[PDB]
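Let us walk through a complete example step by step. Step one is to write down the protein sequence. Step two is to encode the small molecule, thymidine-3',5'-diphosphate, as a SMILES string so that its atoms and bonds are unambiguous. Step three, shown after the inputs, is the structure prediction itself.
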Amino acid sequence: LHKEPATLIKAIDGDTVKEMYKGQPMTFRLLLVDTPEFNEKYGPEASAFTKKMVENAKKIEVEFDKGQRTDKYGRGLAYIYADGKMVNEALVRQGLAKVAYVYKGNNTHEQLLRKAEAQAKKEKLNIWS
Ligand SMILES: Cc1cn([C@H]2C[C@H](OP(=O)(O)O)[C@@H](COP(=O)(O)O)O2)c(=O)[nH]c1=O
Ligand SMILES: [Ca+2]
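Step three: the predicted structure of the complex.
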């Protein structure tokens, strides 16, 4: 895989972010994770985590996997990086997302994220508390 540029348009919630990619606005859904909805427990906190992460970053990047790049709702599916740090993984490491939606096409970083989840679980972090 490789990183490609994008600029933040707007944080949306824990695992969705509006970004400009190849000069077009689009909503990205983070691969391999599931944050709770804003209305659920840790939802506000997930949204807050992702927001600060992408808003503070001098450089946002987008990384498509090998399978499909758009989901059935037209959302981009990618690993998103903030100054080189992966938002998907960072959420999971903090117990603010579960590893989820692991489809055979698009799972390059599954084991990395599962390793993070294990550590979050060990620490009884947030969702795991
Ligand atoms: C993360 C991800 C979600 N989706 C779809 C499956 C789920 O469909 P349904 O909406 O029919 O449940 C939905 C989960 O997104 P949210 O967790 O953002 O709701 O998005 C994919 O198709 N591919 C993916 O990689
Ligand atoms: Ca969600």
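Step four is interpretation. The first strand starts at residue 4 and ends at 13.
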